């Protein structure tokens, strides 16, 4: 405990002492540009879409959202967002097989984990359907914490 260090009883930790919750809020929104390009909330698939994040996607529902009460790990696609693009626009590699849209998802922070608490869907002032996601996690007291 020297130099302002401490020594905390292990069992008290085991009995919930100084335990605490943590709530992160992920929010994302689809923005259309001139009502020509339509950002979309749906579950992307590693086949019909291009340039997708190497995290898993199965935790998504059909509409591209994670069901609440589902345990999640880092680098997991919380929100399935896609953006259509012109097939003959840039030809950035493999675009000559997909022609549909590219991944623009919002995965979970790779270093985070826990249970998705609740997911709500609503609109901004301008009717743009969007979603906030809240993640619950318990932070047990540990060696490095500052008291």
């Amino acid at each position: 405990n020297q130099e302002d260090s401490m020594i905390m009883n292990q069992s008290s930790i085991d009995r919930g002492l100084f335990r605490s919750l943590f709530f992160r809020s992920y929010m994302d929104q689809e923005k259309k540009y001139g009502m020509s390009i339509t950002e979309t909330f749906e579950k992307p698939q590693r086949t019909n879409t291009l340039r997708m994040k190497h995290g898993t996607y199965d935790k998504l529902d059909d509409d591209g959202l994670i069901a609440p009460g589902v345990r999640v790990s880092g680098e997991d696609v919380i929100i399935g967002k896609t953006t259509p693009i012109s097939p003959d626009e840039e030809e950035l590699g493999q675009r000559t097989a997909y022609h549909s849209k590219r991944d623009a998802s919002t995965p979970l922070r790779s270093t985070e984990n826990g249970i998705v608490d609740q997911v709500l869907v609503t609109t901004n002032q301008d009717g743009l359907k969007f979603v906030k996601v809240r993640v619950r996690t318990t932070k047990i007291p540990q060696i490095g914490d500052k008291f």
Partner: protein
């Protein structure tokens, strides 16, 4: 779960509930069983249904 309490919160409290354990020796250590995640000779399964009425 529809409480005003977190799942693990409730789950953690459930852990700290003492149970009668006189014949604990009459059970087998969880890792010792070849069981499929549990067995009647390895563990006790408890359930709980509560509904505000």
């Amino acid at each position: 779960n529809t409480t005003v309490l977190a799942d693990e919160f409730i789950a953690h409290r459930l852990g700290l509930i003492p149970l009668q354990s006189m014949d604990i020796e009459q059970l087998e250590y969880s890792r010792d069983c070849f069981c499929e995640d549990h067995c009647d000779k390895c563990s006790v399964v408890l359930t709980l249904q509560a509904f505000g009425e």
